[PDB]
């Protein structure tokens, strides 16, 4: 599913993401926007290390979810990567929460450093009533 912006913001709010480990809903929305365009079917294959990033948060198969085909992998979310391509983002949100329990928090998504950190991210939740 490709979420509409405020649709996703409300969904993430209902799923307990606002302020999770200090992270505002707008920062989660910025992450989803840049990682996937709010698309739960997004995938990106990383030829350099044989891993794949999956779903709305682009969770990686070398470190976070299991897809079988990625060498030297650990499954920190204890999830099949297929669970991260669903329209129902509950499993994705559970994994994202697990990612940000690591010390780096949301900086675990390196691109979030580039696209979101130390910026005005209020536009991602403007008008959504969250």
From Swiss-Prot:
Gene Ontology MF terms: identical protein binding; lysozyme activity
Task: Fetch the SMART domains from UniProt.
Answer: LYZ1
* CDD domains (alphabetical): LYZ_C
Keywords from UniProt, A to Z, are: Amyloid, Amyloidosis, Antimicrobial, Bacteriolytic enzyme, Disease variant, Disulfide bond, Glycosidase, Hydrolase, Secreted, Signal
Its domain of life reads Eukaryota
Q: Which GO terms describe its cellular component?
A: azurophil granule lumen; extracellular exosome; extracellular region; extracellular space; specific granule lumen; tertiary granule lumen
Please name the catalytic residues of this protein.
Answer: 35, 53
Keyword Phosphoprotein appears in the UniProt entry = no
Q: List the disulfide bonds.
A: 6-128, 30-116, 65-81, 77-95
Family matches, as InterPro entries: Glyco_hydro_22, Glyco_hydro_22_CS, Glyco_hydro_22_lys, Lysozyme-like_dom_sf
Where in or outside the cell? Secreted
GO biological process terms held by the UniProt record: antimicrobial humoral response; defense response to bacterium; defense response to Gram-negative bacterium; defense response to Gram-positive bacterium; inflammatory response; killing of cells of another organism
| EC code | 3.2.1.17
Q: What is its main location?
A: secreted
PANTHER family xrefs: LYSOZYME C
Q: Which medical condition is this protein associated with?
A: Amyloidosis, hereditary systemic 5: A form of hereditary systemic amyloidosis, a disorder characterized by amyloid deposition in multiple tissues resulting in a wide clinical spectrum. AMYLD5 primarily affects the viscera, and the predominant clinical features are renal dysfunction of varying severity, and intra-abdominal bleeding. Inheritance is autosomal dominant.
Instruction: State how it assembles.
Output: Monomer.
The record's family statement is:
Belongs to the glycosyl hydrolase 22 family.
Q: What is this protein called?
A: Lysozyme C
Q: Which gene encodes it?
A: LYZ
